[PDB]
Amino acid sequence: SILDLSKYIDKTIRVKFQGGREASGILKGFDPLLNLVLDGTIEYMRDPDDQYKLTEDTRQLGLVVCRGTSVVLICPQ
Amino acid sequence: LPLELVDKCIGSRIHIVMKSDKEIVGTLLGFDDFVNMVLEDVTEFEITPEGRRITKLDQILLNGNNITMLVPGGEG
Amino acid sequence: TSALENYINRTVAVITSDGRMIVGTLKGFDQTINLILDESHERVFSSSQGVEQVVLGLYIVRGDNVAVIGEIDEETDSALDLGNIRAEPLNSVAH
Amino acid sequence: LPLSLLKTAQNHPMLVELKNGETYNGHLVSCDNWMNINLREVICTSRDGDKFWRMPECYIRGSTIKYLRIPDE
Amino acid sequence: VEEPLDLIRLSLDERIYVKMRNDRELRGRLHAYDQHLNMILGDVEETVTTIEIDEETYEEIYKSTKRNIPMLFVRGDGVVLVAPP
Amino acid sequence: MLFYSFFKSLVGKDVVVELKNDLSICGTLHSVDQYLNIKLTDISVTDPEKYPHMLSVKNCFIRGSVVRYVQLPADEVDTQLLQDAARKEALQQKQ
Amino acid sequence: QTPSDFLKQIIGRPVVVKLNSGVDYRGVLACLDGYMNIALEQTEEYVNGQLKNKYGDAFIRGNNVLYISTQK
Numbered sequence A: 001s002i003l004d005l006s007k008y009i010d011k012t013i014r015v016k017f018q019g020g021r022e023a024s025g026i027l028k029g030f031d032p033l034l035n036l037v038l039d040g041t042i043e044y045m046r047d048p049d050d051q052y053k054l055t056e057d058t059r060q061l062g063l064v065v066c067r068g069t070s071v072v073l074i075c076p077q
Numbered sequence B: 001l002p003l004e005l006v007d008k009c010i011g012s013r014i015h016i017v018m019k020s021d022k023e024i025v026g027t028l029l030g031f032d033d034f035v036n037m038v039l040e041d042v043t044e045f046e047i048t049p050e051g052r053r054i055t056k057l058d059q060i061l062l063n064g065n066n067i068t069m070l071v072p073g074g075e076g
Numbered sequence C: 001t002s003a004l005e006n007y008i009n010r011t012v013a014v015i016t017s018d019g020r021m022i023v024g025t026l027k028g029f030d031q032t033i034n035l036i037l038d039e040s041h042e043r044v045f046s047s048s049q050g051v052e053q054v055v056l057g058l059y060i061v062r063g064d065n066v067a068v069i070g071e072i073d074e075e076t077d078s079a080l081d082l083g084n085i086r087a088e089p090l091n092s093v094a095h
Numbered sequence D: 001l002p003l004s005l006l007k008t009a010q011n012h013p014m015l016v017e018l019k020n021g022e023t024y025n026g027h028l029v030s031c032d033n034w035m036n037i038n039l040r041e042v043i044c045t046s047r048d049g050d051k052f053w054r055m056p057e058c059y060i061r062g063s064t065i066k067y068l069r070i071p072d073e
Numbered sequence E: 001v002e003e004p005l006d007l008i009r010l011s012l013d014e015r016i017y018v019k020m021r022n023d024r025e026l027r028g029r030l031h032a033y034d035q036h037l038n039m040i041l042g043d044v045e046e047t048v049t050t051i052e053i054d055e056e057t058y059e060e061i062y063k064s065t066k067r068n069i070p071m072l073f074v075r076g077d078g079v080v081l082v083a084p085p
Numbered sequence F: 001m002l003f004y005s006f007f008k009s010l011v012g013k014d015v016v017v018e019l020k021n022d023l024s025i026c027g028t029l030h031s032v033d034q035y036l037n038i039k040l041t042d043i044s045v046t047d048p049e050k051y052p053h054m055l056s057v058k059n060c061f062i063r064g065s066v067v068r069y070v071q072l073p074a075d076e077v078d079t080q081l082l083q084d085a086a087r088k089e090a091l092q093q094k095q
Numbered sequence G: 001q002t003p004s005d006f007l008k009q010i011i012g013r014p015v016v017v018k019l020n021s022g023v024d025y026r027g028v029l030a031c032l033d034g035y036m037n038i039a040l041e042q043t044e045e046y047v048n049g050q051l052k053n054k055y056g057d058a059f060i061r062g063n064n065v066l067y068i069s070t071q072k
Helices: B002-008 D002-008 E004-011 F002-008 F079-094 G002-008
Strands: A012-017 A022-030 A036-044 A058-066 A071-076 B013-018 B022-031 B037-046 B051-055 B059-062 B067-072 C011-016 C020-028 C035-041 C059-061 C066-072 D013-018 D023-031 D037-045 D051-060 D065-069 E015-020 E024-033 E039-053 E060-074 E079-083 F014-019 F024-032 F038-045 F057-062 F067-072 G014-019 G024-032 G038-046 G050-053 G058-060 G065-070
Touching: A012 A036, A022 A058, A022 B002, A036 B002, A058 B002, B002 B067, B013 B037, B022 B059, B022 G002, B037 G002, B059 G002, C011 C035, C035 D002, C059 D002, D002 D023, D013 D037, D023 D051, E004 E024, E004 F079, E004 G024, E004 G038, E004 G058, E015 E039, E024 E060, E024 F002, E024 F079, F002 F024, F002 F079, F014 F038, F024 F057, G014 G038, G024 G058
Parallel strands: none
Antiparallel strands: A012 A022, A012 A071, A022 A036, A036 A058, A058 B067, A071 D051, B013 B022, B013 B067, B022 B037, B037 B051, B037 B059, B059 G065, C011 C020, C011 C066, C020 C035, C035 C059, C059 D065, C066 F057, D013 D023, D013 D065, D023 D037, D037 D051, E015 E024, E015 E079, E024 E039, E039 E060, E060 F067, E079 G058, F014 F024, F014 F067, F024 F038, F038 F057, G014 G024, G014 G065, G024 G038, G038 G050, G038 G058
């Protein structure tokens, strides 16, 4: 449709998700429904005390799939 | 392809992270079109409280409505 | 049939699901209630600073966030009645 | 009429308030029939005014949009 | 295969207990429902449950109020569960 | 279909709509659509006018998604129709 | 297909059904459907201890169901 993810196919991207989650990782693949395969995946959470201090709330997850149904915004990193 | 990755994870350990601070680690038995997933002998963690909530035995159907992330091989 | 046809280019009161009233003019709509509106302003702050009341002219409200549209009895453009500020502020649609 | 206005609003400055109270300020480059957007030259901001990041393109899922403030034009 | 909906239509004309979102429950006679769990209930009683807190001790006192009505439509999105009283 | 057809029978009846925001509205049913959006004519805020945010509003469009409750009188409804139609309908949605 | 076969071979078993709101319901699975609507007989309800014990069938909305599990 509107965004061809082939331009983003191999770089680190920033993805916000519906439950408040932020994830960052290298795009390795995708589908038309915006399911994504990310490598080197970092998941960040957001609490009332973690706003500019977004680094303490960090988990590593390695290779992941992000479900395209809960994707709220996608941008470069 | 993402759904091909999820197919490759059948019979492997997988960690299923919801939208909330909650996640489910278990063996992936299979899934449907909507990514409702059948998991066997599942551990349920809340991340925020730092603790498991239950050790499930047998199979669970975990709805794909709240599923944000799928991690093949599980945690670390 | 229940369309928003009769409310076109007439003054309207909109309640968003957040619990926020809006005075506006409805220029356009679709079949998901995505509201295209002009000359929008609030209602809870007009009695404090009437300049600050005017948020904007021209905005798209998404139909998912619209609760309520009410039709108001406008005489001619440049007039409406009433104001309020000591009321138990209105809640959201979530519970 | 609304999505039709967004199709013709291609190239305008826009401010996008999302469900999560974050603000996006950018220039619309594309919309679809489901109201998803891509936008050029972007400021991310919390509702309280905290500027967290700046980007050249961004994609916004239409389901997460609260409203779009367009120019007075 | 009786579906849950087929087994809940066996309780038609009978008094049911409905637990709703927002700490509320209804009891009434089930006249109708659909697959979304929209419901028409006759002779209903709504109960609203709230938590009052003592300002000094932080001890919670449970309080309730009740409303009753002849005939009522209920949107299915507010329904958490259905059972008898 | 069932509740869409049910609300088509109640056009021109006086009903009270209670919302998810706790606002309760008396009004005369004018129209309904496939998503059960309601258009109400000659409205008044019931319980008290503690929600004065309308006042100058006589007809409202209500998004079907923000309805919590629609209170009705017993005189408006055939309970035999409703039980028979419901048994037929749950049988229809799943088969 | 893997879920429809799951559905078939959990009829009659004791299960735990957890909703999105975090309420847990335990009992015998009288019926389920494709949209995850559930009826359970002998249902307990948990959140902060025992909150309800149920004496007839309870019906649960599939749109609000987070998981269903066999209890062992």
